[PDB]
Write an enzyme that holds these catalytic residues in place. Sequence first.
Site, PDB file in Angstrom:
ATOM      1  N   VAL A 289      21.190 -16.725 -41.603  1.00 42.45           N
ATOM      2  CA  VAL A 289      22.578 -16.970 -41.209  1.00 42.45           C
ATOM      3  C   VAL A 289      23.294 -17.992 -41.934  1.00 42.45           C
ATOM      4  O   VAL A 289      24.624 -18.040 -42.269  1.00 42.45           O
ATOM      5  CB  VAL A 289      22.312 -17.504 -39.624  1.00 42.45           C
ATOM      6  CG1 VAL A 289      23.432 -18.352 -39.193  1.00 42.45           C
ATOM      7  CG2 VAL A 289      22.154 -16.277 -38.798  1.00 42.45           C
ATOM      8  N   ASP A 336      69.443 -18.187 -63.128  1.00 38.34           N
ATOM      9  CA  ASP A 336      71.184 -17.961 -63.420  1.00 38.34           C
ATOM     10  C   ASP A 336      71.897 -18.878 -63.099  1.00 38.34           C
ATOM     11  O   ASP A 336      71.458 -19.929 -62.550  1.00 38.34           O
ATOM     12  CB  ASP A 336      71.472 -16.637 -62.744  1.00 38.34           C
ATOM     13  CG  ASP A 336      71.686 -16.825 -61.242  1.00 38.34           C
ATOM     14  OD1 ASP A 336      71.172 -17.767 -60.636  1.00 38.34           O
ATOM     15  OD2 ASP A 336      71.901 -15.862 -60.386  1.00 38.34           O
TER      16      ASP A 336
HETATM   17 CA    CA Z   1      26.620 -19.827 -42.945  1.00 41.49          CA
END
Ligand code: CA
Length: 896
Positions: A289, A336
């Site tokens: 995770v 321009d």
């Molecule tokens: Ca993480």
Amino acid sequence: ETMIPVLTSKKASELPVSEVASILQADLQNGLNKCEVSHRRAFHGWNEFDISEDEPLWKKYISQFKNPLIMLLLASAVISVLMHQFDDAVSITVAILIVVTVAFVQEYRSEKSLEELSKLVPPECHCVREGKLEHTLARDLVPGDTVCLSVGDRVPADLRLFEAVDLSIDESSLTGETTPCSKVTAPQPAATNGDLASRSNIAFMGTLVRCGKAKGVVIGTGENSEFGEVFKMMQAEEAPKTPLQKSMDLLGKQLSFYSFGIIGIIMLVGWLLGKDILEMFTISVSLAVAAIPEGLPIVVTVTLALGVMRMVKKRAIVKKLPIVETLGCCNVICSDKTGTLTKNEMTVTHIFTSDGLHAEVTGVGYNQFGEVIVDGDVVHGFYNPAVSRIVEAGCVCNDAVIRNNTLMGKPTEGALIALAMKMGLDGLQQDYIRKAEYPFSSEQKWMAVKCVHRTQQDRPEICFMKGAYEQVIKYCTTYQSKGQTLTLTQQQRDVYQQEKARMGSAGLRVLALASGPELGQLTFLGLVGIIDPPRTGVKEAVTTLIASGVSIKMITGDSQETAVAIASRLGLYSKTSQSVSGEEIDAMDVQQLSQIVPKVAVFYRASPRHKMKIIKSLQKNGSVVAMTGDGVNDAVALKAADIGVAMGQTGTDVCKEAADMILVDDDFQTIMSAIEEGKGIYNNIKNFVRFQLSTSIAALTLISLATLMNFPNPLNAMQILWINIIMDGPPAQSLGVEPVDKDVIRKPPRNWKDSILTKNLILKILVSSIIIVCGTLFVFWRELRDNVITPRDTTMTFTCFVFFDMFNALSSRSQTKSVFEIGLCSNRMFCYAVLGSIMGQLLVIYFPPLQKVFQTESLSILDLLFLLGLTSSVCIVAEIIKKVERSREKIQKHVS
Ligand SMILES: [Ca+2]
């Protein structure tokens, strides 16, 4: 009280104008009053497509139970519940709830930013109310209002046309037909109606007016529209993703795959020897995770939105997401004349008198800021008779006036009133009473008036003369020489002609002046040099852009002399730089001009076709162009080319809807701001990637080194989750959000074939990871001499890792500049996040509930001081390495 019904397009087309107006109770001339407009607001509502209801917060709260890493975490929690270990299960449950809460806040912030990044460019239109033409948003429009349609404007809603003059609108976005259909005002037969295919009487919403001017009575707004439903179903679609987002996603996928493989190998190795299956499994799940990029695209979105909104705070508006990343890669930035490099106002710069003195006029615009300098001396009022007579003849014999810095009439004359007023002679015009006037004509190329003094009418009539030199000099017979009137000879005429030629070669618009009692016996006064002056910061901006390496190409429509003088006075022109005429661009087009376009900077007497030609040539060899332009002819030039920098002040709706980012100030100084914002976004992304990679590598190396020889690991699942939230939470967002540094404007432009992970960043990542791992291992071995301490080793190693991560975040704020240069307290929210993280760590360490949850033992002051002293071994090393690198770079630049 006779509620106004909504007339559908077919019905509004089938009845004539009078019946439709009577049904809608609409006034064709005076329009609708404010009270009735508000009542129709109350009944009908906002002219905007009905929104799709968004899911509430609990939908998203439940939806984060997906990505089943949390599912195996909960499976481990319930397995521990069935295994009769309530403390660990409740601790991992609390950690899970904290993780989902933080992910919910992050997702809510990202989604709110994405939703709010939709109001930058609102629809615009013109409406007639109470007999006055009001400039109001299209969201205000209610049926029965009168809306005027002009060339280039976007149709805000459906209307019933009653007046039209050669109308030409584009329904390609609504019907797919490439040929615009001419519109009429007569009612159409009802039988001739399938799809539009004929409907020249009714105006449809979303179409683009190409030519003609017309007025119409709106018949329906919002949902009530025949192709309104088609437009609504076209909307609410997924926008395309920028290539930078795709590269970030690919890098995240690669990192996730490598982390998953490493975690699996580590888990298998650990299970090979004697350990705990459940503890190792949940620790590996927590590590997977942690070492997975879930905040990288989120922080990319937030930093892109923040940069876009910071540009919006400046005088520039950016519409498209994948356009911003191309701002930093622009190298062929173009501009321009008449609006971009030079303000669209005439200003007199050089004054040459009959006696030969040269006068320089400072300041720009039709304002009082500026001075006239003669031989190093400032002349005010009538101090110098030669210049005074010239400005008197100019101001008295003039038709234009200046009010509130706004000029109506001839710009060349308005520059002359500005010049006369600069020294305080604005009231000299009212001091004379004009008797006879000769208006300006193209055939004569001159004009003059006869006037007398208001308070000295007894004085003889004085005629003030001006115009082209060839015409003025014909009526002049004498000239003033140091207060003495002398006959005009051929030699002085030749001197006058050579002065005129010199002025013309320098971009000055030559205008002559004279005064006398009658035409044909006039006394010459002098010449005035009129030139379109550059803006305030255009010169410095051009110099800075050229010094970095960003080439600037100038395209205009004036003569060669004016264009080359403007280029030389700004810095665009160099020793080796040619210029291509418009006729030459027309004759030969694509093949043999790309070999000369990298060494050219001036285009004069050009055209939109020449703009397309130079765009194609500059895109042939490969570059990012910044073509500008406003109007209708400059639409394809902004469509088919690179970033279409347009103007929201003098531009039309075409360049604001069917083009790229727009400017609201019409200045050249707003491009470097966008470039700096893009480079700062890139630097923030690089810093976030570097910090995340360094912390993930350090954590993975520490866990692998603990697992390899069955060493007791110092971090459990909850501590790993807390380290993950530290690396992918408030601190990650604080690192990703950072103000830009005023040093990227000197950096060479970024190439398209580049990579975020450079060699230096990677080397720094491994250096920081090695230092952190070595420090943590040293602390662990120092505390582990008596061989039996279960809570304190874990607590101290976890807090040392937290301090190391905080110091790495402090050090990774910039790659080339030390944290001292930007200051210790530069980003307030970064400091707030750091303080919050410190408070959370202290609460975890000291709170008995948090102590039980995280298996934490209270430390002492001496241990905390030792940890703080030890955790600085990475920040100082990074700072001295950066200092050595920048010192070496400076030395190499100096000796070069
Ligand atoms: Ca993480």
